[PDB]
Amino acid sequence: TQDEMKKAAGWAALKYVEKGSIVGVGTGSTVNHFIDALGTMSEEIKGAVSSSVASTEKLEALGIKIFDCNEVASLDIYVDGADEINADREMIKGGGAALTREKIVAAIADKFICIVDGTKAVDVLGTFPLPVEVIPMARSYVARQLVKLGGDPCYREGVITDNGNVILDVYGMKITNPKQLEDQINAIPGVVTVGLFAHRGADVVITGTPEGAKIEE
Amino acid sequence: TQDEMKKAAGWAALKYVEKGSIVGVGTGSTVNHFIDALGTMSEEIKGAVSSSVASTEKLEALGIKIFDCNEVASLDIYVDGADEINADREMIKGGGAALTREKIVAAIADKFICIVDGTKAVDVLGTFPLPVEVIPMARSYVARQLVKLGGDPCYREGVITDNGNVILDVYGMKITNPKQLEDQINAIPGVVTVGLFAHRGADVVITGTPEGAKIEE
Numbered sequence: 001t002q003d004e005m006k007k008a009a010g011w012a013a014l015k016y017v018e019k020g021s022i023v024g025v026g027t028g029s030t031v032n033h034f035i036d037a038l039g040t041m042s043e044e045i046k047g048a049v050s051s052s053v054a055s056t057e058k059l060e061a062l063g064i065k066i067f068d069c070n071e072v073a074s075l076d077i078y079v080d081g082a083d084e085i086n087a088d089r090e091m092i093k094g095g096g097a098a099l100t101r102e103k104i105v106a107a108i109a110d111k112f113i114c115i116v117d118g119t120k121a122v123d124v125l126g127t128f129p130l131p132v133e134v135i136p137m138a139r140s141y142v143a144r145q146l147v148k149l150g151g152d153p154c155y156r157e158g159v160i161t162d163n164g165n166v167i168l169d170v171y172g173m174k175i176t177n178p179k180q181l182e183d184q185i186n187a188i189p190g191v192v193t194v195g196l197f198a199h200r201g202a203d204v205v206i207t208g209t210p211e212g213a214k215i216e217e
Numbered sequence: 218t219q220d221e222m223k224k225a226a227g228w229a230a231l232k233y234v235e236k237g238s239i240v241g242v243g244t245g246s247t248v249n250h251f252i253d254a255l256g257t258m259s260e261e262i263k264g265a266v267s268s269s270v271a272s273t274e275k276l277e278a279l280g281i282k283i284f285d286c287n288e289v290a291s292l293d294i295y296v297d298g299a300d301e302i303n304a305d306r307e308m309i310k311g312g313g314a315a316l317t318r319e320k321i322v323a324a325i326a327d328k329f330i331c332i333v334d335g336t337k338a339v340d341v342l343g344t345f346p347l348p349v350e351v352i353p354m355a356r357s358y359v360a361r362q363l364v365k366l367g368g369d370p371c372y373r374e375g376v377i378t379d380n381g382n383v384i385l386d387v388y389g390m391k392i393t394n395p396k397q398l399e400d401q402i403n404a405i406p407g408v409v410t411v412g413l414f415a416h417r418g419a420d421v422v423i424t425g426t427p428e429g430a431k432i433e434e
């Protein structure tokens with residue numbers, strides 16, 4: 001879209017931030033704008049948990065206390081973007097962000113508020129390549145296993161995750177049963193995290209639009 | 218029980234080694250006797266893939282070439298001990314070994330040869346604590362989910378894995394559906410690897426008995 005639909009979206013999420021709460025925050029241009037609105041009410045927020053280095057440092061600057069996951073038993077909400085989202089509110093995530101961090105913070109939060117522009121909604125997950133984080137000694141193993149499942153895995157070379165794992169971006173899948181494929185990939189030895197958020201998906205999906213931001217609760 | 222028994226199981230495994238092959242080798246006292254056996258055949262095999270730092274050293278001193286998992290497309294056999302093993306040949310492993318390492322070599326290998334003394338076979342898995350490797354930031358969350366599954370997770374403090382992950386040793390479970398439980402744990406965000414070898418269990422079980430090795434196939 002334009003930076004303004006993203007921004008319309010990001011600011012519409014501020015309405016789920018209640019007083020005295022600790023806010024799950026994700027990462028991305030759309031969440032950027034959400035962090036901008038969150039700063040306008042820093043005084044009635046206990047603080048935040050972020051799955052992103054950029055967001056954390058931005059929350060800090062704004063004087064928002066940062067929590068770690070092990071300090072909390074739950075989050076009320078986690079606000080975050082998606083790579084793709086289907087009509088069942090299942091998503092591909094982690095293409096351009098810390099996949100493992102996201103999926104953990106999302107797991108701990110009660111409500112997932114997905115904030116997105118017009119380009120993320122799809123009927124069938126998979127045109128956007130699915131990321132899988134992989135123990136490096138297992139990389140060729142996992143790739144073979146992803147092939148068998150009807151993917152074409154491409155090793156994201158020259159980079160690792162903060163933990164030192166590698167990433168395979170899997171192309172060419174027609175992910176008609178995301179919950180199944182999550183299970184299948186999660187069961188391959190050497191898999192760390194898969195970027196299918198199917199068992200746990202979006203709860204509220206906010207889309208940026210020319211005029212304003214449509215909310216699907 | 219006795220090392221004589223462990224020794225008996227270890228040497229009994231030599232029989233499964235093909236001239237010219239690259240052998241999957243595991244860890245432990247029983248495995249060391251197998252490494253002894255492999256030695257008497259050094260100049261005749263191609264090399265070994267090891268799941269163990271101590272086993273790697275031992276193979277090297279026999280002049281056996283070390284291959285990494287990324288270097289092979291498969292392994293013929295993987296010979297390894299287990300912490301517990303049921304009548305369905307499903308195993309708890311990783312208790313005092315490189316959990317993730319073992320599960321990956323085990324996945325890549327065609328036949329898993331489990332060498333044990335009399336003390337490893339159990340009726341129901343779970344008296345020995347189930348090791349789960351966990352992303353640090355996920356530890357409390359994953360612990361809370363394992364409790365929901367009927368376990369009492371105990372954080373193995375002072376140590377991390379190679380990967381820099383932590384270990385939860387999970388006591389108190391009656392693991393009467395190992396395939397199911399491995400599915401449930403594998404699907405908790407923040408889990409890296411669980412010490413249930415259930416979907417891929419042992420193909421051959423060698424037990425050292427008071428009356429020689431005994432082979433269950």
Ligand SMILES: O=C(CO)[C@H](O)[C@H](O)COP(=O)(O)O
Nearest residue numbers: 028030081082083094096097
């Ligand atoms: O890569 C994904 C998560 O890793 C997301 O789609 C992205 O990080 C955030 O969305 P956007 O930049 O479109 O607002």
Ligand SMILES: O=C(CO)[C@H](O)[C@H](O)COP(=O)(O)O
Nearest residue numbers: 245247298299300312313314
């Ligand atoms: O591969 C290791 C996993 O914990 C162990 O060494 C194996 O389970 C046990 O065999 P042994 O009783 O001789 O050590």
